[PDB]
Design an enzyme around this catalytic site. Structure first.
Site, short mmCIF file in Angstrom:
data_model
loop_
_atom_site.label_atom_id
_atom_site.label_comp_id
_atom_site.label_asym_id
_atom_site.label_seq_id
_atom_site.Cartn_x
_atom_site.Cartn_y
_atom_site.Cartn_z
N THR G 1 -30.20 -16.35 1.58
CA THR G 1 -29.72 -17.28 1.40
C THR G 1 -29.38 -17.11 -0.05
OG1 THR G 1 -31.88 -18.39 2.70
CG2 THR G 1 -31.01 -19.85 0.96
N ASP G 17 -24.84 -20.30 3.60
CA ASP G 17 -24.38 -19.41 4.47
C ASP G 17 -24.91 -19.98 5.05
OD1 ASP G 17 -27.03 -19.32 3.32
OD2 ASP G 17 -26.97 -16.89 3.03
N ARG G 19 -27.83 -18.15 7.51
CA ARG G 19 -29.29 -17.59 7.86
C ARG G 19 -30.38 -17.43 8.00
NH1 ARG G 19 -27.06 -11.47 6.78
NH2 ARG G 19 -29.41 -11.05 7.31
N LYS G 33 -28.11 -25.64 6.60
CA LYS G 33 -28.67 -25.79 5.24
C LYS G 33 -28.07 -26.84 4.13
CE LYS G 33 -29.61 -20.35 4.83
NZ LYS G 33 -29.56 -19.43 3.99
N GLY G 47 -35.51 -22.13 -0.48
CA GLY G 47 -37.50 -21.22 -0.12
C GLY G 47 -37.58 -21.49 0.87
N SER G 129 -31.81 -16.59 -2.27
CA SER G 129 -32.28 -15.10 -3.01
C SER G 129 -30.88 -13.76 -3.24
CB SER G 129 -32.60 -14.61 -1.19
OG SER G 129 -31.83 -14.71 -0.76
N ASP G 166 -26.18 -9.43 -0.49
CA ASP G 166 -27.70 -9.70 -0.54
C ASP G 166 -28.11 -9.53 1.39
OD1 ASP G 166 -30.52 -11.07 -1.77
OD2 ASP G 166 -29.68 -11.81 0.55
N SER G 169 -28.70 -12.76 3.87
CA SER G 169 -27.73 -13.27 3.89
C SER G 169 -26.85 -13.42 4.79
CB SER G 169 -27.85 -14.18 2.58
OG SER G 169 -28.21 -14.49 1.48
#
Lengths: 204, 213, 201, 124, 191, 199, 220, 215, 191, 199
Positions: G1, G17, G19, G33, G47, G129, G166, G169
C-alpha cells in the site's frame, strides 16, 4: 486456527451471460468427519445466491440473520434485491460485530435482474467488499484455488465450458487440501434456467 | 531477542521426464517487505547429470551447497568415479539429519538422470526424509503449483482423456505458463525464470522474464 | 496416518495408507509407509517420517553385522530390543516414532510394537496412527486366528478404507504386505477411489 | 599412562612374549576333557591337597552360566579375572538377544579379549 | 557515577564524585573512584562496584609485569588496550564505564574512553557515569581549545558541581587529580 | 494409573497385579505382565511411565543374577531391596531420573517372608501390605479392615477376591484381569489368573 | 500500500496503487483506494481496509448533511475536525491512516491523519507500507509552486517507487487532480506491469468431468 | 553479542566504471543519544578492497583487528598473492555463519567494496550469514530510503561515470539526514580505483528548510 | 520533544524544536509545537502527539467560552488550572508534557509547568521534553536574574541548539515566540 | 468422557446411552439417566460438564411444554431441534456460555423419523447415525461398516449389541450398563436395559 476448525471452500466464477458457484460438502471437527451433506450455498431470491465458509456456527447463524433482513426488505419495497445492494447489506451486518466478529467469509454470485448481467464479490470477516470480473474464492484452501483459476479462466465462456472449468478448478484444489472434500456441489445460473450438479469426487 | 532464522522466499520446480529432467526457479532474494536483489537463482549444477534446488533461509542454502560440493570431491578421490543421482540423495539425507536438533531451514529438490538415462526427482523435507517422484514444487508458491501439475502431468480428475507421456516441447511451455500464474498471486515469486534442462548431452539454461512487482 | 498389523495362522499381514500432510496442506499421496528392513523383516512409519526412516535404516545396518558374525539371522525379539535401546538415549529430546516390527522367527510369527517413549510390547493385533482408533473397530469384528489367506486380505484392506473415510489426515492408496515362512511378499496396492466403487455395490 | 610396546616381533618372525607365556601354561596342572553324545565329562588332575586347607577355594572348574562350565591351566591369578569378565559378557547377552549364550559365542569373546591384549601398550 | 577527564598540553586532569548508592541508600558516603594503575596512568571507574574493582586489579597485575620486563615506562594506549580485552571478552558479565587517562613520555597526555560495550576511542575530553547526561550541554558550550592546567581544574570543578546538584545518584565531595610529567597532584575539593 | 497389591502372611507373600497395557484411550494389550523375577525367591513389581519400567527393572535383574554367579549363593530379599534404593537415589539428582514406583517381595530362609515398598523418590518401607496406583485409594481400606497377622493363605486369596471385586464397582477404569503369584519356602508358584468375565 | 499527495500552484494531486494482500497472497488486483467525500474533497486510505471504508463513508455522509443545511460548499478543516475527534474517541482501535485533501474557499489544503488521532498540515505527505520509498522521491525532487504537469509527473514517479521496491504494493497507478474548478479522477493513469501471455493450450471439452446427479429448474 | 550497546547506522555503496564508492557517517549512537561524534566506520583493507559496517561498533573493532592480522601475515610471505575482494567476502560470510550457529552472533551488517583485475566488486554480508552481490547496496534505513533512489538510476542507466556516482551518493546521504533520527551531518566517502583506496575527509551536506514557512 | 519557556519582566519567551519521530523515522520534519489558546496565552506540548492535540482543543473550547461570558481577558493561572484538571482526571490515559506561558494584565508574564503526573507549579523558567535532560547543566549556570527580552531570545536559542545537537529525537528548526503586552512576535530561526 | 449413540431407521429411531455418573476417580451412581423427554415423540440426549447438562436441557423442556399448552399441538422434531440451536448460539458470545454436546431424536407424522446432531458450538447436522464421547472414535467405524438405510429394528438392536461389545474390549473406561429407547409412530418405548455382567 479458528477458520481451520471445520474447513470449507467456496468458489464463484463469471461467464458470458451466466455465473457459476461451487462448494464442498464435508462437515467435520478438526480431524473427523460427521456428515457429507452440509449446506453452504443459500438461495437469496431467484438468480442470486450466496456462499458461506468458515466456522460452521456462523455459517448457519449469518445465513439466518441475513434472511431475516432480506424478507423485510422485499416486503417493505415491492421488488427483488439487486446483487449490488445485497453486498452493502451483508457488509453492514458483519461490521456491527466489529469486536465480536463472525468467523465467516461470504461469497455472493448472481445476475442483475433487469439487465441480465453477472456479478461476483467477496468479503472478509469484518466486511471489506471486493468486486472482481473473473473469480473469487474463500475458504481454507485458498492458495490452491488461485493456481487453478489463474491458469484456467477465459474471458467469454458459454455455460458448457464454464461448468468444465469450475469443476476442474474445484476437484484439483480441494483434493490437495486435507480438511476439505467429501463431495462438491455446483450451481450454474443463467437468465432462463438454473442447474445444480454434484460431482464424482474422491471420498478419500 | 536474536532469532537465528528468517524467511527469504523462493520457489523451485522439477519435472522428471523420460530422457530428461527440467529444474526451474525464480531469481528474487527478499526478506521482510524489501528486495535485496533481482538476480539470485537457485539452479546449482552439481555434476553434468544432477542439478539441485535450494529454497528457504538463504544463509543455510549457501552453507549446505558448499558442504555438498566438498563431499562430491571426497567420493571421487576415494572411489575413482563420480556420484550417481541416487547416491547423492542418500548422502544428503544423512547430512540434514546430522543437525536434527538445530535443523537447516532449507527445502531441497534434486533433479537429474539415473544410470539408464531416465529422469529422477527427489524431494526433501528440512529433516531429511525423501522419496522419488515425477514432479515436485517447493518453496513459497508450492501450494499453487502442485495442484496444476496434477491436472496436466498426472492427468488426474479427468475423464475420457488419453494418456500421452510428456514430451520435452510440451514440458517447456507448461513450466513457462505456471510461473506466470504464480507471479501474479504470490508476492515472493520474482522476475527472471532460470530454467535448467538436464539431458543425456549436458545442461542447457534459459532465462525468461516475469513481472517485477 | 494409519497403519495396522495382525498375525494369524498363515503369517502376518501388514497394511498402511500413503498420505503425508503438512499442517492442512497435503505434501504427497504416494508415501510408502511400510519400509523394507530385510528380506525377512518389515517396519512401519508412524509419527515423524524422517525419524522412522533413519533409525530403521540404522537398524538394518545393525542386523546385517549380526548375521555376518553369528552366521544366522537375528530374531524378531532381538531386533526390536536393539531399536528400543537406541531410541531411549534420546528420551525427552523430542523424537516422534511409533513403528512396529514384523517378521517370521524360529518361534513362529513375530509382531512387536516400539515407541519413542520406550514401550516395547508383544501382541496379536496393533493399529498405530492418527486414524488408528477407526481401524480397531472394524478389525476387532472380523478378526479370527483361523482366517483364510484371501479372507485376511479383505479384512485388512477394508479396515484401512474405513479409517481413511473418517480421518482427514489419512488417505492415498492402500499398500498391503504378507509375511510368510521364507520371507515377506508384496501383495497389492489399491487406490481408495477404486475401492470406493468396489465396496459400495 | 605407561606406554611401551611389550610384545614385539623377533628377527625371524615370532612373538617372544607370547611363546614365553605358553611355557607358563606348560607347568600348570593337567586338565582333561572329552565329550559324549549326551553327557560331557571334564576333570582336572593334580589337586595336590595338603589336608589343612578348604577344598572349595582351590577349585578350577567354574561355571559361566547354567550351561557353560570352564576349566583352565597356567597361573591362577590371571585366570579368575578372565572368568569374571566373561561372566559379565554372558550376562549382558541376556539383556540383548533373549536366548542364553551359545558355547561358541563365549569363546570368541575370550579369545578376542586375549588377542588384543597381546597388541596393546604396556601389557604382558 | 559521575566521572570526567580533560587533557591539556602537558597532561590530563581527572575528577569524580564520592557517592556510592545501593538502590536508594547511601552505602559509602566518601569514595575514591580515581584508581592508580601505574605512576602516571590512572583510571576512573563507574557502573558496577565489584566488577570495576576486580578488572582494575587484573590490569595492574598485567601492566606492572609488562613494564618490569621491557624495562621502560608503559604507554597509555597500552593500558587502554588491556581494559578493552577484558571488557570485550566478558561483555556479557560486566558493567564497566572505565575512562583511562594519564601522561606518557612519547605522546604526552592521553584520554581514552571504554564504555560498557567494550570499544575504545581517544577523545579530547571524556565524560561518563549515570549523572553525566545532565551536563552534556554545559560541557559542549563551555569547552575551549587550548586551556591551561589551572583552567582545566576550574572547568572540571564546575561541571561536577552541576551534575551532583541535579542527579540523585551523584553527590558527596569532589576528588581531583592532575597528572603531568612532574608527578600527580591530588586534592579533595568542595564547592 | 494401574494397580498392584502386597498381602504378606506369616510364611508367604501374596502379590498380584493387573494385565493391562494402556495407550491414549485404547488398551494395546490385555495380558501384559508387570512381574519380574530376579532369584528363586525374589520378585519385582514395577509401575511408572513408559520406558523406565522396563529398562530400570531389568538393569536390577542383571546385577542380582551376576551376584549369584560370582559367589554361588543368592542375595537376601533385604539386601536386594536395599540395593535398588541406592540406584534410584544416585540417579535422582541427575539429568535423567527414573520415574518408577515399585514394591519388592521376597522370602528368605533366615527371617522368613518380607515385603518392601518404594516410590519414585526411593524411600524404603517394610510393610505388611501395600498397594500402588489410583486403586490403592479404594482398596487399602478394605485390606486393613480385615487383615490379621496370622492369616492363612487360603483365606488370603478370598481376601484378595473381596479387595478386587470392589475395584470393579466404584472405579472408572476397566481392569478386567489379574495375575497372582505366591512366594514361600519352595519358591515362586503361579496361582490362577483370576478375572471377571465381561461377556 | 502506497498513497501520496502533493500541493501544486493551483490545487492538489493524490495518488495510490491498486493491490490488497491478505497475508502474503495477492487478493485484489484493482482495489480502488481513493474515496469520495465531497465534490471538492477526496481522501486516500491505508491500514485496515474495512476500517477505512466505514470511516470514510460516515464522514462523507455527515458533510452531505452539513453542506445541504448550510447551503454552501464544505471546508477541508471541517473534515479534519470530524475525523480526528472520532478516531481519538476509539483510542486507536480503528486502524485507519488517511491522506486528506481538498480545495475549499481558502485554497488547497493537505492533511495526514494517523489512527490515534494526530494530524498535521503539510505540502506533501506519504502513507502506507511503501511510504518510505515514496518519501525519498518527494524529498529529492520537490519544488514549491509546480505546474500540474510537473505535479502529475512527480506523484506517478513516487507511487512507482513504492511499486518496484515494496512487496505489499504494485499495480496500476491511480491519480486525482483537484483544482479550484476542475476535478479529474482517473484510475488507469499508467500500466507499468502487465501479465504474461499463455503459451500452452489447456482447453478441455465437454464430457471430461464425471457427474453423479444433475437437476434442471426452469425460470421465466 | 546479545545486545548492541553503541551502534552505527546506514552505509551506502554503488559501482561505477572502474571502481566502487562507499559512504557512511561518523556517528556512534547509544540508544537515542549521540555520544561519539568523531568515529570512523570505514576500514581500508590493503589496496583493492574496502569495508564499511553498521550495527554494534565494538564488534566492528574486533573484525578490524582480525582482518588486520590476516593481511599483515600474508604480505610478508612474498608469495605474489593477495586476497581478492570476493575471497574476503567469502571468508567474512563463513565467520558470520559459524558464529550464529553457536548462538552468539556479531551484531553487524557489512558492505565490501573492491576493484581487482579490471572489474568492480560489491558484496553484502548479514549478521545471520546472508550474503549476495549487487550493483548497489544499502543497510539499515538506507534499504528503505536510499535504495529506491539507487535502483531507478541503475535501471534507466546501467553504467555510471565516477562523477555521476559521487553526485548520486551525496543526494542519498542528504535524504538520510532528513528522514532518519539516527543520522548526523558529517560523513566521509571512500573510493577504490585501479590507483588504490582513498578515504575523503569529514564532508557535510546542504539542507533546505523552505517549507518551514508554510503554516 | 524539547520545549522551553523563559519569562522576563514584560512577558515571556517560548521556544521548541520541529522534529516529530515515529520510533526512529522522522514523520514530520517541521512541526509547530507552539499552540495558541488565547491571544496572549500559549502552550508548548510534548509527549504523545495525539493526546496533547486533543487536550489543547478542549481547553481552547472551555477558556474561550469562559472569557466571552465574563467579558474580560482571561488569566494565565486560569488556563493552567484547566490543563491540570484534565491531566489529573485522565492521568492513566495521557502522556502530556504541557508548559503554559503567557502575559496577563493583572500579573504580567507567568510560566507554569504541567508534567505527566498532573501537578502544576509556577517557575521562573521551565524546560521539558525528552531532550531537556541534556541541558539541565547549561541552563543552571547560564541563567541570570533580570534579563531583557533580547537576551532571553538569545538564551533560549543557544539552549535549544545544544539539545538538538546531542539528542537523536530532537532536531529540525527552532521556532520562537515572544509574548508581551503589545502582541506576539513569532519567528523561525536556525543556527 | 461418556457415551451415547444414534441409530436411525426407516420408520424408527434407536437411541441409547450409558448409565454412569462419574466423579474424581470413583463413580457416584451406576443407574444415571441422560434421557430427557419433551413431547410424546421427541427425546433429548445431553452430554457435557456438570451443571450445564441438567439446567439447559430442562430449560428447553419448559419451553416445548409451553408451546403445546398455548396452541394445543406439539412442535415438529425439526423445529424443536432448530429452537435449541438458537439458544446456544445466543448464549455463546456471553459471560456464561453453556458447554454441552447433544443430539436430538424425534418422530413426526409428516416426514417420519429424524435425528439431529449438535456440539458445544451449536452446529446442526441431519445425520443417519451419530455418537458423542471418546467412545465415538471406537464405535463409528463398526456402525458405517454394517449400516443399511433399509434396516429392520430387530437387527438394529443386534447391530447396537455388536457396537457395544467392542466398547468393552479396547476402551479404558468401565461403562457396564446401557439404557435403550425406541421412537416410532406410537411414541416412546423402553427397551431392555442391556448390560454386561461384571460378576
Amino acid at each position: 486456527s479458528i477458520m481451520s476448525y471445520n474447513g470449507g471452500a467456496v468458489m464463484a466464477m463469471k461467464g458470458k451471460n451466466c455465473v457459476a458457484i461451487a462448494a464442498d460438502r464435508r462437515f467435520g471437527i478438526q480431524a473427523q468427519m460427521v456428515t457429507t451433506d452440509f449446506q453452504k450455498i443459500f438461495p437469496m431470491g431467484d438468480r442470486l445466491y450466496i456462499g458461506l465458509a468458515g466456522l460452521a456456527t456462523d455459517v448457519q447463524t449469518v445465513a439466518q440473520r441475513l434472511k431475516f433482513r432480506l424478507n423485510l426488505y422485499e416486503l417493505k419495497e415491492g421488488r427483488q434485491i439487486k446483487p449490488y445492494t445485497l453486498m452493502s447489506m451483508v457488509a453492514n451486518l458483519l461490521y456491527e460485530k466489529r469486536f465480536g466478529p463472525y468467523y465467516t467469509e461470504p461469497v455472493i454470485a448472481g445476475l442483475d435482474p433487469k439487465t441480465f448481467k453477472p456479478f461476483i464479490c467477496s468479503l472478509d470477516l469484518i466486511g471489506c467488499p471486493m468486486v472482481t470480473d473473473d473469480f473469487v474464492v474463500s475458504g481454507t484452501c485458498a492458495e490452491q484455488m488461485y493456481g487453478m483459476c489463474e491458469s484456467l479462466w477465459e474471458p467469454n465462456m458459454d455455460p458448457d465450458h464454464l461448468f468444465e472449468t469450475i469443476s476442474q478448478a474445484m476437484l484439483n484444489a480441494v483434493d490437495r487440501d486435507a480438511v476439505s472434500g467429501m463431495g462438491v456441489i455446483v450451481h450454474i445460473i443463467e437468465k432462463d434456467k438454473i442447474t445444480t450438479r454434484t460431482l464424482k469426487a474422491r471420498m478419500d | 531477542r536474536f532469532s537465528p532464522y528468517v524467511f527469504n522466499g523462493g520457489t523451485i520446480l522439477a519435472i522428471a521426464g523420460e530422457d530428461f529432467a527440467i529444474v526451474a526457479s525464480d531469481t528474487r532474494l527478499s526478506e521482510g517487505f524489501s528486495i535485496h536483489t533481482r538476480d539470485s537463482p537457485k539452479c546449482y549444477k552439481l555434476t553434468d547429470k544432477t542439478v539441485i534446488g535450494c529454497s528457504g533461509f538463504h544463509g543455510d542454502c549457501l552453507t549446505l551447497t558448499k558442504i555438498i560440493e566438498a563431499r562430491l570431491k571426497m567420493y571421487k578421490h576415494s572411489n575413482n568415479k563420480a556420484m550417481t543421482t541416487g547416491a547423492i540423495a542418500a548422502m544428503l539425507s544423512t547430512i540434514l539429519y546430522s543437525r536434527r536438533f538445530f535443523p537447516y531451514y532449507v527445502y531441497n529438490i534434486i533433479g537429474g538422470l539415473d544410470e539408464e538415462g531416465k529422469g529422477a526427482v527427489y524431494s526433501f523435507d528440512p529433516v531429511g526424509s525423501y522419496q522419488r517422484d515425477s514432479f515436485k514444487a517447493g518453496g513459497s508458491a508450492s501450494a499453487m503449483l502442485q495442484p496444476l501439475l496434477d491436472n496436466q502431468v498426472g492427468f488426474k480428475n479427468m475423464q475420457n482423456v488419453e494418456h500421452v507421456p510428456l514430451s520435452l516441447d510440451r514440458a517447456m511451455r507448461l513450466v513457462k505458463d505456471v510461473f506466470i500464474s504464480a507471479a501474479e498471486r504470490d508476492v515472493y515469486t520474482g522476475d527472471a525464470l532460470r530454467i535448467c534442462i538436464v539431458t543425456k548431452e549436458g545442461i542447457r539454461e534459459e532465462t525468461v522474464s516475469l513481472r517485477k512487482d | 496416518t494409519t497403519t495396522l498389523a495382525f498375525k494369524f495362522r498363515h503369517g502376518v499381514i501388514v497394511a498402511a495408507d500413503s498420505r503425508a500432510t503438512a499442517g492442512a496442506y497435503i505434501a504427497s499421496q504416494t508415501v510408502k509407509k511400510v519400509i523394507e528392513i530385510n528380506p525377512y523383516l518389515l517396519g512401519t512409519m508412524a509419527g515423524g517420517a524422517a525419524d522412522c526412516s533413519f533409525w530403521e535404516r540404522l537398524l538394518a545396518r545393525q542386523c546385517r553385522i549380526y548375521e555376518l558374525r553369528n552366521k544366522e539371522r537375528i530374531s524378531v525379539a532381538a531386533a526390536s530390543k536393539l531399536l528400543a535401546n537406541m531410541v531411549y538415549q534420546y528420551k525427552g529430546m523430542g523424537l516422534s516414532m511409533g513403528t512396529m516390527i514384523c517378521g517370521w522367527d524360529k518361534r513362529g510369527p513375530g509382531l512387536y510394537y516400539v515407541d519413542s517413549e520406550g514401550n516395547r510390547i508383544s501382541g496379536a493385533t496393533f493399529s498405530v496412527g492418527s486414524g488408528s482408533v477407526y481401524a480397531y473397530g472394524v478389525m476387532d469384528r472380523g478378526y479370527s486366528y483361523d482366517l483364510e489367506v484371501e479372507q485376511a486380505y479383505d479384512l485388512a484392506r477394508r479396515a484401512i478404507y474405513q479409517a481413511t473415510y473418517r480421518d482427514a489426515y489419512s488417505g492415498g492408496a492402500v499398500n498391503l504386505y504378507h509375511v510368510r515362512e521364507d520371507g515377506w511378499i508384496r501383495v497389492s496396492s489399491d487406490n481408495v477411489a477404486d475401492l470406493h466403487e468396489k465396496y459400495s455395490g | 599412562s605407561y606406554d611401551r610396546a611389550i610384545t614385539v616381533f623377533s628377527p625371524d618372525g615370532h612373538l617372544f612374549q607370547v611363546e614365553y607365556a605358553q611355557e607358563a601354561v606348560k607347568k600348570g596342572s593337567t586338565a582333561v576333557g572329552v565329550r559324549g553324545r549326551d553327557i560331557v565329562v571334564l576333570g582336572v588332575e593334580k589337586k595336590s591337597v595338603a589336608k589343612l586347607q578348604d577344598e572349595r577355594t582351590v577349585r578350577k572348574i567354574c561355571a559361566l552360566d547354567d550351561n557353560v562350565c570352564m576349566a583352565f591351566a597356567g597361573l591362577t591369578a590371571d585366570a579368575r579375572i578372565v572368568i569374571n569378565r566373561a561372566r559379565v559378557e554372558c550376562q549382558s547377552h541376556r539383556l540383548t538377544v533373549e536366548d542364553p549364550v551359545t558355547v561358541e559365542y563365549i569363546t570368541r569373546y575370550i579369545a578376542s579379549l586375549k588377542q588384543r591384549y597381546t597388541q596393546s601398550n604396556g601389557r604382558r | 557515577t559521575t566521572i570526567m577527564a580533560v587533557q591539556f598540553d602537558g597532561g590530563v586532569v581527572l575528577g569524580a564524585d564520592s557517592r556510592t548508592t545501593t538502590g536508594s541508600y547511601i552505602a559509602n558516603r566518601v569514595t575514591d573512584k580515581l584508581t592508580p594503575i601505574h605512576d602516571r596512568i590512572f583510571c576512573c571507574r563507574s557502573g558496577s562496584a565489584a566488577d570495576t574493582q576486580a578488572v582494575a586489579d587484573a590490569v595492574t597485575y598485567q601492566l606492572g609485569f609488562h613494564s618490569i620486563e621491557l624495562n621502560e615506562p608503559p604507554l597509555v594506549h597500552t593500558a587502554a588496550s588491556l581494559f578493552k580485552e577484558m571488557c570485550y571478552r566478558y561483555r556479557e558479565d560486566l558493567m564497566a564505564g572505565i575512562i583511562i587517562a594519564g601522561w606518557d613520555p612519547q605522546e604526552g597526555g592521553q584520554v581514552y574512553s571504554v564504555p560498557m560495550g567494550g570499544m575504545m576511542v581517544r577523545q579530547s575530553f571524556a565524560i561518563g557515569g549515570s549523572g553525566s547526561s545532565y551536563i552534556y550541554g554545559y560541557v559542549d558550550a563551555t569547552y575551549r581549545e587550548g586551556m591551561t592546567k589551572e583552567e582545566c581544574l576550574q572547568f572540571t570543578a564546575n561541571a561536577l558541581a552541576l551534575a551532583m546538584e541535579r542527579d540523585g545518584s551523584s553527590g558527596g565531595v569532589i576528588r581531583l587529580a592532575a597528572i603531568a610529567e612532574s608527578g600527580v597532584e591530588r586534592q579533595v575539593l568542595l564547592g | 494409573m494401574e494397580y498392584l497389591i502386597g498381602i504378606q502372611g506369616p510364611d508367604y507373600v501374596l502379590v498380584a497385579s493387573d494385565r493391562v497395557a494402556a495407550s491414549n484411550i485404547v488398551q494395546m494389550k490385555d495380558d501384559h505382565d508387570k512381574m519380574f523375577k530376579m532369584s528363586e525367591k525374589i520378585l519385582l513389581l514395577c509401575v511408572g511411565e513408559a520406558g523406565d519400567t522396563v529398562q530400570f527393572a531389568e538393569y536390577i535383574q542383571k546385577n542380582v543374577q551376576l551376584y549369584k554367579m560370582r559367589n554361588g549363593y543368592e542375595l537376601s530379599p533385604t539386601a536386594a531391596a536395599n540395593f535398588t534404593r541406592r540406584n534410584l537415589a544416585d540417579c535422582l539428582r541427575s539429568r535423567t531420573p527414573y520415574h518408577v514406583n515399585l514394591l519388592l517381595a521376597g522370602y528368605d530362609e533366615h527371617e522368613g517372608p518380607a515385603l518392601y515398598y518404594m516410590d519414585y523418590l526411593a524411600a524404603l518401607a517394610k510393610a505388611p501390605f501395600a498397594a500402588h496406583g489410583y486403586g490403592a485409594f479404594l482398596t487399602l481400606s478394605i485390606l486393613d479392615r480385615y487383615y490379621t497377622p496370622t492369616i492363612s493363605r487360603e483365606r488370603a486369596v478370598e481376601l484378595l477376591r473381596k479387595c478386587l471385586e470392589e475395584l470393579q464397582k466404584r472405579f472408572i477404569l476397566n481392569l478386567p484381569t489379574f495375575s497372582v503369584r505366591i512366594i514361600d519356602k519352595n519358591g515362586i508358584h503361579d496361582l490362577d489368573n483370576i478375572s471377571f468375565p465381561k461377556q | 500500500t502506497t498513497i501520496a499527495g502533493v500541493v501544486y500552484k493551483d490545487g492538489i494531486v493524490l495518488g495510490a496503487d491498486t493491490r490488497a494482500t491478505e497475508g502474503m497472497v495477492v487478493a485484489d488486483k484493482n482495489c480502488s483506494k481513493i474515496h469520495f467525500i465531497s465534490p471538492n474533497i477526496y481522501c486516500c486510505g491505508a491500514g485496515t481496509a474495512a476500517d477505512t471504508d466505514m470511516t470514510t463513508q460516515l464522514i462523507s455522509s455527515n458533510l452531505e448533511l452539513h453542506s445541504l443545511s448550510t447551503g454552501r460548499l464544505p471546508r477541508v478543516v471541517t473534515a479534519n475536525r470530524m475525523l480526528k475527534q472520532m478516531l481519538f474517541r476509539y483510542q486507536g482501535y480503528i486502524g485507519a491512516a488517511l491522506v486528506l485533501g481538498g480545495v475549499d474557499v481558502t485554497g488547497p489544503h493537505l492533511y495526514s491523519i494517523y489512527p490515534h488521532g494526530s494530524t498535521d498540515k503539510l505540502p506533501y505527505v506519504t502513507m502506507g507500507s511503501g511510504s518510505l520509498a515514496a518519501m525519498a522521491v518527494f524529498e529529492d525532487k520537490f519544488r514549491p509552486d509546480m505546474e500540474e504537469e510537473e505535479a502529475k509527473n512527480l506523484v506517478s514517479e513516487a507511487i512507482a517507487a513504492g511499486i518496484f521496491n515494496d512487496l505489499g504494493s504494485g499495480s496500476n497507478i491511480d491519480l486525482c487532480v483537484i483544482s479550484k474548478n476542475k476535478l479529474d479522477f482517473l484510475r488507469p493513469y499508467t500500466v507499468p506491469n502487465k501479465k504474461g501471455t499463455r503459451l500452452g493450450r489447456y482447453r478441455c471439452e465437454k464430457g471430461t468431468t464425471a457427474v453423479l446427479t444433475e437437476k434442471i429448474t426452469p425460470l421465466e | 553479542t546479545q545486545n548492541p550497546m553503541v551502534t552505527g547506522t546506514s552505509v551506502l555503496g554503488v559501482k561505477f566504471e572502474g571502481g566502487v564508492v562507499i559512504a557512511a557517517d561518523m556517528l556512534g549512537s547509544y540508544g537515542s543519544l549521540a555520544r561519539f561524534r568523531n568515529i570512523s566506520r570505514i576500514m581500508r583493507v590493503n589496496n583493492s578492497t574496502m569495508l564499511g559496517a553498521s550495527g554494534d561498533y565494538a564488534d566492528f573493532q574486533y573484525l578490524k583487528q582480525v582482518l588486520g592480522q590476516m593481511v599483515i601475515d600474508e604480505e610478508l610471505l612474498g608469495d605474489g598473492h593477495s586476497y581478492s575482494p570476493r575471497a574476503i567476502h567469502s571468508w567474512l560470510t563463513r565467520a558470520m555463519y559459524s558464529r550464529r550457529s553457536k548462538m552468539n552472533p556479531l551484531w553487524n551488517t557489512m558492505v565490501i567494496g573492491g576493484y581487482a583485475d579490471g572489474e568492480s566488486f560489491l558484496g553484502y554480508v548479514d549478521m545471520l550469514g546472508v550474503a549476495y552481490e549487487a550493483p548497489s547496496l544499502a543497510t539499515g534505513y538506507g534499504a528503505y530510503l536510499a535504495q529506491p533512489l539507487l535502483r531507478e538510476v541503475l535501471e534507466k542507466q546501467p553504467v555510471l561515470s565516477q562523477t555521476e556516482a559521487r553526485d548520486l551518493v551525496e543526494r542519498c546521504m542528504r535524504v538520510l539526514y532528513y528522514r532518519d533520527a539516527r543520522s548526523y551531518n558529517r560523513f566521509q566517502i571512500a573510493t577504490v580505483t585501479e590507483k588504490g583506496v582513498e578515504i575523503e575527509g569529514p564532508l557535510s551536506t546542504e539542507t533546505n528548510w523552505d517549507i518551514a514557512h508554510m503554516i
